[model samples]
Target chain A: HERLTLDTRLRQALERNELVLHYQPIVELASGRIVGGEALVRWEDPERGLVMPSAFIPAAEDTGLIVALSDWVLEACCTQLRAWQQQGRAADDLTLSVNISTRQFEGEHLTRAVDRALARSGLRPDCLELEITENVMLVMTDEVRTCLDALRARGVRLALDDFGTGYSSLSYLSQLPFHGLKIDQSFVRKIPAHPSETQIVTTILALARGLGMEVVAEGIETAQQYAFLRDRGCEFGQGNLMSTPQAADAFASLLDRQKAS
Target chain B: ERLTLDTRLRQALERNELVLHYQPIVELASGRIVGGEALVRWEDPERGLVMPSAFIPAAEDTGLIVALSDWVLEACCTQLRAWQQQGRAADDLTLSVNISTRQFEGEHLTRAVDRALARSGLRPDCLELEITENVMLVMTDEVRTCLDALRARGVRLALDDFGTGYSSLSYLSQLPFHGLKIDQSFVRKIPAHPSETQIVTTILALARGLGMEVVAEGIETAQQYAFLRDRGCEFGQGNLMSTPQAADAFASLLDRQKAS
Candidate 1:
């Protein structure tokens, strides 16, 4: 019954535009400057306030509503990016990244999606980074490959999100044309105490560096994690140590702080 | 819709609308037909042949999987018995079946397996039970005890869909699994995605270290097969070998292997 109710609410949320994108700043490790922001989805439910992605993402994915939901996410992110550019905000140069759910990549919608979003917002293709998971790379057919190549050809950057959490195969970097790799938080959480984790993190950094791809260490909640990644040439980091994902207005103020600093 | 599906599935189980489809799990190095996985399918009257993905969630939610799995086990054992009567390479082949989470909870699971084996008179060693990584996460003393009991009965245990879940390396080492089936997600990216290649290598190494065999799932292309074979993968099963086939269709594969 609860599942049914949530599914119903999710559909309603999409129609009502109750779905929102919260931006989490991805900061350069070396200079400690915001280089990009990952646009994460949240549902503003009338009864539940703000529902996290974890609560509704699985439902969305299962119901095949993720295709529509992700379309909205892309449009919202581009609109936000365009708004920042129009205001001449300090964060204008900041690239906006949106997660492309595995469901969205299944058909011809992805390439068409980017075209629609970019055309609507008038945002440059280069300013939008499509964050995909290892799962997306696994489902690579000739069709999916063509979609990816088309997107790459269009000049939209692609970042592999949750790098090591899935099956972290180095062949993915060689085969798929991903521009960035985001280290999963599981490795980051245990980096301080676990020697094995440190080794894994170091290897991922080296792998990303060797591939000439940008590395973003996720879940960097400690000064030590920040120091370790910075010293190890990790290009970007995002986690609570810096700031949690915030709504558009709050995130705009966050940009003010970054500019002031 | 959920209610309707639930009622339909309940009737489907009673009417024996479910059937098992077997896909061969071949030895990577030798290309031998060592074993096969028994996948469930529903012969829905209106919907046609329904895959597990189409109806499994409803089954699981409605606690129909417990009943469904029982029927599958019985059907599998009956098939095994039929093959035994045919008296060829069939007796040498091992049959693997996936046990759902709900089925695992019921204290009758071990009895169910015991009953299947006893009724069919199939050798215990020739039956393998495949479990997902999620099983370990939901562990309790009862589940642990049941696993131990199954192991004691000489039924081989496999950790299915490896590396796709919140896996604990500790569970890999601690569990009494004889094999690990690399998830299709990992295998699908092979030769092209270096990270997937590296992860496969690491998992293969880990499984070898634990003295467990590794079966790479979803081998669609020749290159993926070559990659796994080169990396010391012990076994594999997917479209590259064969899709899930009916009992008679799979039995012919065993017959062919014997003749050759």
Candidate 2:
């Protein structure tokens, strides 16, 4: 009952354009290049002030607003991304990351929505990166696998988000045509401080490099964490140590700096 | 725990704590032994026996896989030579060793295989190397050269675990594997799931068209065996026929087959 109330508000939030995306810069750790940004969804409720995705995601899922909300995020993110690419290219090609829920992958909806966004915005399919968490692998349905395979074949990059956090079919990894994986912050947070975590990170870095897969790690909050990952050969990441999630104009200023440098 | 395993695996390689257990590949029609695959097992002192699933990735990550595979290549060649010289098995008897991607680097594996064969006097044709990787994605020009060198020397190259869901059949002609082993996941559904039956049938047809020998891995039931045999799958391996055995135990099996 309480969740329903929250979800009804989420529905209105999407309809009224109260939901917004804040972009977090994804940096190439080696050279400190802002290669791209990941979209972090937030709720700008009139009464509630500001709400995190964690606060209403499940409620939206239960009430089925996630699909509509998921579509809107893609459409909204895709449009702004094109002009942003117009900023002087310091990072070669800038990738735009968006979360892809399992619900979005249901039926042919994923392809439909993804095709719509790319076509309407005139964004190259490779410019858009789809991020799916580890659990998506646990119960990968035919439709889900088909949708991902279809998109990946179309030149879109697929990333495994929150890897090493939950149930993961790492062995099935070789079978999938994945572009890269996001190192979970929980795993990243303990680096250098914990010898054990360093071992795991080293192993993760080595395994990804061996497969010719790039990695984008998160959860870096210190120079030590940043240094450790780069030293261990991790090339890309986004974390608090660099910059927190910020509004579109705020992140645009980041691109502004990239143009100058 | 991974750290612990990594350290232990290095020591295991140095101290020779690894042993190869042979699983017989059989003629499906009469259940007769034709060849065996060399599967590595770790005889850990504290943990008793460790499976490759337990430490192979550790081996892979630590770069110990090259050394580990070197041992396996030489060991498998020597063991098979010893078995062939016993006079019970036929000259055509084959033995397969699953090869990892790292082995192709620097042409070390090619030189190692040549040395082992010459040293043991095992006919190169009697040895088969199984490429378990997605050969298309993993193959470099140098890798292609290494594979060609081995094949030119008469080593059989098999496309291991065929019908894995992610592979592209369109590229099968590119690698030109000498044999194709239908992955166990497909065979597990035999006589039960018709959808899987069609998949198995399609793979068999592809193998036949490619002129590749067909070996179905992981036969667990008489029904699975009957289906494959009826469908013209040439060879079978799994618990239904014979589990992986030690050298003496496998020798006794070969002796019994000949004596009868």
Candidate 3:
């Protein structure tokens, strides 16, 4: 019922060319390298002014607009990516991360889609990273493993997004060849003040080190938090202080500022 | 010509009635219980008294006596052997030994003959022991593997006539044998006279130390028997005790000896 209202609005939003990506720069804590960036959905809704993915994602999902939306955003990112790479931008090899929703996951021939994107854009699979939270894997089927294996086998890296929030089973660490662990922002941001949280982060870093897995600390807000994560051996950090989700132009300027500095 | 005379003697010796002999053992220091050797011979006037050296070398040369002696010995020893499990002292065990000279050195049919002999007489193959391991080395291929397999198969292995030759230390410790016959010279004059007796005793003591069964040869004299019998020497054979005789005579001797 709510899906119909949202589906019409989503279609209208797409026709009106109002869809945009807010960039999340994944900064390497050790070297401050922009290893990758996650492109989160942003809707320039006429009435609500701006809407986060959370508000519209479920409606779009129930209405089955997720596949269209994900595909649209993926193509948009890849075309812009190809244009930039064609222009010989320095981080052309950098990975572009995208969230994969469940409905888009179900009917999606993700392998074909990725192959098509790589072939059409002349971009390497390594330049496109798919971020899937553990919840996405909760609905397991042969297709999911097949799809993920195919993507990674072809050089696209898969990350366990919001890693510990769901499952919390470290068995998946080896069961699935996940490239990195995104230490949920809740645990990461809390680490600066909470000794227990700091201990958890430190322990995760040690465990991840032993496993040859990388650690991504989310929501790195304060300088103290950044320094705390840096000290704890966190590899990557993403948060407001790192520069709030910005447009490509603004995001590229942040990179320029860092380069200038 | 000498061997021709021996062959004539062996020919006059009826092949049908060739026999094996068993000699008992006692502890070297304690003189308690168990185990013996199966010595092969023929008691005939023409063949007079044949040592294993005489016939074994002949049998081995042609490989004819491999099956011949294997069957004859199995018939003899298997009959005398009252397996310790069957109404005998716990220490009394089957160590039916035989010498396979030419047969052992040449195509050693001793392995297959031992099997056939055991099967023919219904003797446990493990009980039909042929004490040889040195021949296994320096001799090629299958014998080594076969002898090793025999050891693995729970056949009691021994260094027959131990210390008479340059004992291959490689074969001695490495071969899977259960015992060694401490050379009779080593046990002949033990605890009594000659300087060699001490060395002989030392060898016996060493074999026992290595957990091998040591048999004293030429233990017929009362003094010698008492000396070896009193100590923990487990097995012995010689004339002062009981010479190789007919099966009935030996059986009666064993009965009387047991009764006494």
The local distance difference test score of each candidate is: 0.82, 0.80, 0.63
Which residue runs of candidate 3 sit more than 4 Å off their true CA positions? A259-261, B1-260
How does the DockQ of candidate 2 come out?
A: 0.02
Tell me how large the interface RMSD of candidate 3 is.
Answer: 31.1
Q: How big is the positional error of residue B107 in model 1, measured in Å on the Cα after superposition?
A: 20
Over the stretch B1-260, how does candidate 3's per-residue lDDT look in tens digits? 35463465346344544566666544445443344555676555555656766666666566656565656555644564433223343334454556564444554544654554455453344364555434533445655665666655555656666655333322343456666665665556655764545445545544443455667766646777666555566666666655555545544544554565
Better of 2 and 3 by DockQ: 2
Assess every candidate by TM-score: 0.54, 0.54, 0.48
Which model, 2 or 3, shows the larger TM-score? 2
lDDT, candidate 2, B148-251, per-residue tens: 78878989888787766333322344455678888888788776986566567766655554456889998999999998888788999998989999878887
TM-score, A chain, model 1: 0.95
lDDT of 2 by residue, A59-121 (tens): 776666789999998888888787676654324488889997777766769899988998999
**Predictions in order: chain A TM-score:** 0.95, 0.95, 0.89
Docking quality tier of model 2: incorrect
